[PDB]
Amino acid sequence: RGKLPPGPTPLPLQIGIKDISKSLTNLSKVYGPVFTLYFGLKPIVVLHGYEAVKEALIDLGEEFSGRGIFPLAERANRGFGIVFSNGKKWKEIRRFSLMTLRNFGMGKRSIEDRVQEEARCLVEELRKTKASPCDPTFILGCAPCNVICSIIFHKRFDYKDQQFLNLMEKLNENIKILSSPWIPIIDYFPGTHNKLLKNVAFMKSYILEKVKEHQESMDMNNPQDFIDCFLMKMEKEKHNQPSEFTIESLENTAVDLFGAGTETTSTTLRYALLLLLKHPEVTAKVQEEIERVIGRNRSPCMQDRSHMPYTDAVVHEVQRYIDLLPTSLPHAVTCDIKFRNYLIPKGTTILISLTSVLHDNKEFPNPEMFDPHHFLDEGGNFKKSKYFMPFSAGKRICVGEALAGMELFLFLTSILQNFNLKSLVDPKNLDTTPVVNGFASVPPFYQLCFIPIHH
């Protein structure tokens, strides 16, 4: 009825995502590009190298857009959102969210507008450190978080408003938790599965505080944020019950936006700065290139990216080098399917090695090293690449690819606009090797001085 690919024989101290993705490459060398790990009798077919991931996610896009069940499910039921939702709930909501996240029925003010307001609120806050050493984690995590508030509620929040420090205390708890290394099973369990639940319930509850307030004032002819907009779709598509667009889904879709939208971004910001210290000649050119195009008066902006081949390459390379999410999130096929020489039954969990594709040794020669010129033709022009998948590929591609890209580019340039960066350690020995993690490439702890600018 269905025949998986060959893999090692089933079943197989502190082990992390960077390590799992290594093991997966080792097994590529033995078994070929497509193979199968068992886990008792849970088959997880893994997918490695560009040709397989292209073939599967892109050329068989629909058949591979399912969501793997993960390590677990959760009876607080998070699969009425985007990340963990499926079939037709997913099709309709993703589409909606997509379009909302690109200025359709969300007031006049744009998403670029918003990352720009924060971009400034963020440089302000980085001047409070007075040039004195500083761990960017808190500040850098606050920005992307506040953007999601703003897209969703329409008010960002001073970096002191308790309502905020609570929201972000809860997100950081789910971080320490989920970025838990493995050992055969993930590490955690001991009294944390219920602090996970408690916290999700807090979050839903709070989005619901704000949803009530939004329903107080609703109005076809004036949406201004996700919640408004969503409620409007719940109107246009009534008498067409039962619906995918309900309150139950609004709530888990927003929770989803904060979850996906924050630590992935802030982690990359954290890693973008770290790499800036360790590579003072690159920061130099970037900062220069920022002089030549944007100066010190105005705010940076998405139109300047295209006049900035070196800066756009640096981000790309920050995003490719760090390998934020070695294996994406897990996939699952939507139905039975013949893929190359194999029938994979409906349901089967698919795992994608983004490491394998971002870290290809032919397309990115010397791929272990960090080098802007990986995204530069021999003439120093900007080189786009079919192999660029920080955000995955195909129909489940990060629904915030464009926004992630906005916050990275606007925030980083802003930071580079107003400040030189001074590492405590001498760049020369500064270790950058990432700390062991449950599902992401996270950087070591570091400090830096944000010195107001001088040439």
Ligand X SMILES: COc1cc(NS(=O)(=O)C(F)(F)F)cc(OC)c1Oc1ccc(C#N)c(Cl)c1
Q: How far is the CB of 218 from ligand HEM (least distance, A)?
A: 24
Which of the residues 262 through 281 are near ligand HEM (CB under 6 A)? 264-265, 268
Question: What does the H/E/C string look like for the chain?
Answer: CCCCCCCCCCCCCCECHHHHHHHHHHHHHHHCCEEEECCCCCCEEEECCHHHHHHHHHCCCHHHCEECCCCCCCCCCCCCCCCCCCHHHHHHHHHHHHHHCCCCCCCCCCHHHHHHHHHHHHHHHHHCCCCCCECCHHHHHHHHHHHHHHHHCCCCCCCCCHHHHHHHHHHHHHHHHHCCCECCCECCCCCCHHHHHHHHHHHHHHHHHHHHHHHHCCCCCCCCCHHHHHHHHHHHCCCCCCCCCCHHHHHHHHHHHHHHHHHHHHHHHHHHHHHHHHCHHHHHHHHHHHHHHHCCCCCCCHHHHCCCHHHHHHHHHHHHHHCCCCCCCCEECCCCEECCCCEECCCCEEEECHHHHHCCCCCCCCCCCCCHHHHECCCCCECCCCCCCCCCCHHHCCCCHHHHHHHHHHHHHHHHHHEEEEECCCCCCCCCCCECCCCCCECCCCCEEEEECCC
* Count of residues engaged in binding ligand X, rule: CB under 6 A: 19
Should residue 313 be labelled a site residue for ligand X when binding is judged by CB under 6 A?
A: no
Footprint of ligand X on 433-452 (CB under 6 A): 437, 440, 442
Residues between 391 and 430 with contacts to ligand HEM, criterion CB under 6 A: 391-392, 396, 398-400, 403-404
> Out of ligand X, ligand HEM, none, which partner does residue 263 contact, by CB within 5 to 8 A per kind?
ligand X
Residue 329 near ligand HEM by CB under 6 A:
yes
Taking CB under 6 A as the rule, does residue 200 contact ligand HEM?
Answer: no
Site string for ligand X, 158-177 (x = CB under 6 A): -------------x--xx--
Q: Which is nearer to ligand HEM, 37 or 56 (CB)?
A: 56
Q: Does 263 bind ligand X (CB under 6 A)?
A: yes
Binding residues for heme: 398
Name the residue nearer to ligand HEM (CB basis): 256 or 289.
Answer: 256
28 binds, options ligand X, ligand HEM, none, Cβ within 5 to 8 A by partner type = none
CB of 400 to ligand HEM, least distance (A): 2
Which residues contact ligand X (rule: CB under 6 A)?
Answer: 78, 83, 171, 174-175, 178-179, 196, 200, 255, 259-260, 262-264, 267, 437, 440, 442
Which residues contact ligand HEM (rule: CB under 6 A)?
Answer: 82-83, 94, 256-257, 260-261, 264-265, 268, 324-325, 328-329, 390-392, 396, 398-400, 403-404
